[PDB]
Amino acid sequence: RKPDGKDLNFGVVRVGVGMTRPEVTWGEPQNMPTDIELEPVTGKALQEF
Amino acid sequence: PQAVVVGVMAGEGVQIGVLLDANAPVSVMTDPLLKVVNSRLRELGEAPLEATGRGRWALCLVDGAPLRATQSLTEQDVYDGDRLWIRFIADTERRSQVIEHISTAVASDLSKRFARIDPIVAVQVGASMVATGVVLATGVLGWWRWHHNTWLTTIYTAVIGVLVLAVAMLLLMRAKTDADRRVADIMLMSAIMPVTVAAAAAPPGPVGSPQAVLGFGVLTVAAALALRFTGRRLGIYTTIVIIGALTMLAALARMVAATSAVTLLSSLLLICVVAYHAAPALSRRLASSVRDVLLQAERARSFLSGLLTGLGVMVVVCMTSLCDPHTGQRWLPLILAGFTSGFLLLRGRSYVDRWQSITLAGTAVIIAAAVCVRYALELSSPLAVSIVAAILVLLPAAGMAAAAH
Numbered sequence: 487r488k489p490d491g492k493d494l495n496f497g498v499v500r501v502g503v504g505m506t507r508p509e510v511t512w513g514e515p516q517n518m519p520t521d522i523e524l525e526p527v528t529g530k531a532l533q534e535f
Numbered sequence: 536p537q538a539v540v541v542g543v544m545a546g547e548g549v550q551i552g553v554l555l556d557a558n559a560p561v562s563v564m565t566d567p568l569l570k571v572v573n574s575r576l577r578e579l580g581e582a583p584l585e586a587t588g589r590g591r592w593a594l595c596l597v598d599g600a601p602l603r604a605t606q607s608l609t610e611q612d613v614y615d616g617d618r619l620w621i622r623f624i625a626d627t628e629r630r631s632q633v634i635e636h637i638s639t640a641v642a643s644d645l646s647k648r649f650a651r652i653d654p655i656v657a658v659q660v661g662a663s664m665v666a667t668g669v670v671l672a673t674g675v676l677g678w679w680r681w682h683h684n685t686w687l688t689t690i691y692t693a694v695i696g697v698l699v700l701a702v703a704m705l706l707l708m709r710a711k712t713d714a715d716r717r718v719a720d721i722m723l724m725s726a727i728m729p730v731t732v733a734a735a736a737a738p739p740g741p742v743g744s745p746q747a748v749l750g751f752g753v754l755t756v757a758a759a760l761a762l763r764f765t766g767r768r769l770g771i772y773t774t775i776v777i778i779g780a781l782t783m784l785a786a787l788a789r790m791v792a793a794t795s796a797v798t799l800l801s802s803l804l805l806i807c808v809v810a811y812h813a814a815p816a817l818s819r820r821l822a823s824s825v826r827d828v829l830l831q832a833e834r835a836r837s838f839l840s841g842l843l844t845g846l847g848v849m850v851v852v853c854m855t856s857l858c859d860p861h862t863g864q865r866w867l868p869l870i871l872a873g874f875t876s877g878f879l880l881l882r883g884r885s886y887v888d889r890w891q892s893i894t895l896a897g898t899a900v901i902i903a904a905a906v907c908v909r910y911a912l913e914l915s916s917p918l919a920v921s922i923v924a925a926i927l928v929l930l931p932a933a934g935m936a937a938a939a940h
Contacts, residue, residue: 503628534635 539608542618544597545572546584550618555608562604565594569621589626594619655714662718666725669695677732681742689736696730707765720768727757727775744790751786755779769837770844777845781806800853804875807846807853811882814842840891847898850875855905860914869906876902903930 489496515532540554551572555564569592573583586592593601597620602611613619634640673692680688703726706719735750758775765772785799793799818839822831854875858868876899883895904927911923 531636 539615544620557609662721673729692729692733699726747786751779751783770841773841774845804853
């Protein structure tokens with residue numbers, strides 16, 4: 487490890503394991519139907535996903 | 536008692552004798568021990584041990600199982616003269632994986648834990664079904680002759696034998712891998728059964744003593760001839776040769792002249808008794824330079840396993856035929872069976888191989904059980920069945936108890 491600015495890991499220490507937010511960036515689905523217009527099968531599929 | 540000398544296995548196979556501290560905990564030794572084996576490899580001119588990515592160094596038994604890092608060498612059942620292995624065990628830490636929609640999730644996981652049917656297995660199943668078919672065909676053909684011993688049975692069976700054998704011939708010449716050989720072997724094994732009844736079905740007139748002699752002869756010859764040229768499936772072929780040869784002698788005697796079955800049965804029993812004593816000697820005589828030792832060891836073991844098995848079949852068939860609930864002093868053969876069973880039960884402990892030791896042990900128990908059943912079905916009575924049932928259930932329970940307790 488180096489302190490010279492480009493090394494972002496300096497001063498960071500591992501304490502264990504757990505959850506973290508992935509590097510993915512989700513875009514909201516366009517023209518989403520209103521709650522009464524949603525089909526039941528595809529609704530929970532996209533929601534739990 | 537302060538130290539113990541043991542062999543340590545290292546990279547690529549070098550065994551080194553070391554004198555270890557008998558009471559320090561094993562985790563304290565693995566670091567300097569690794570240095571020592573590396574230093575010796577360097578002086579020997581070999582390449583040292585090295586790590587690969589993420590992992591750790593551990594000390595294990597020859598079976599690879601690692602020793603508990605905190606326990607003393609004396610706390611574990613490690614004695615002077617034993618051997619251990621130093622090994623690198625890689626890091627298993629990795630992300631967890633989750634699939635939420637259940638239909639996909641069932642398919643994905645279920646497809647990784649089991650094997651789907653494929654063309655290689657399909658062929659073996661086909662071979663297995665045809666073998667099962669012909670043994671049924673010969674069975675029905677062999678049953679017809681008892682009512683009409685005409686030429687039909689032999690004429691019909693002979694052509695099948697030739698045809699199956701002709702197919703097996705092309706398969707044997709073409710085989711390239713062990714999968715191919717298994718297919719061919721199952722086919723060849725099945726060819727012996729039709730040819731046997733085909734020959735035995737040739738002598739005309741009512742079936743009996745004269746027909747039997749040809750069958751067991753050709754059976755013994757066919758089983759023996761296959762082994763000579765094939766060199767595979769030693770156990771199954773060998774067992775047939777023994778039972779065939781012995782029956783040929785017995786059949787010949789009965790056909791020529793024999794006052795009683797007891798006479799022949801007693802003779803066979805004695806022949807097996809002496810054979811049981813000679814068994815290991817027969818196996819020894821029947822069987823880059825290192826390879827020669829490995830081949831001989833399993834071959835000898837194979838022949839012995841079939842030999843012990845075949846004799847077992849003969850004595851159980853003979854003993855169950857010798858004892859009888861109506862003939863004379865009914866108790867005399869029953870006690871003789873007991874003495875015979877004890878010898879086999881006692882001698883079975885002298886064999887280290889599981890199948891050799893287990894088959895011998897099982898042979899004695901089945902003899903006892905068969906006699907109990909014999910004296911129960913015939914000369915039937917409420918007390919007789921009652922008495923036999925109690926004995927037959929407690930007999931094995933006692934054997935299990937002697938080993939379990």
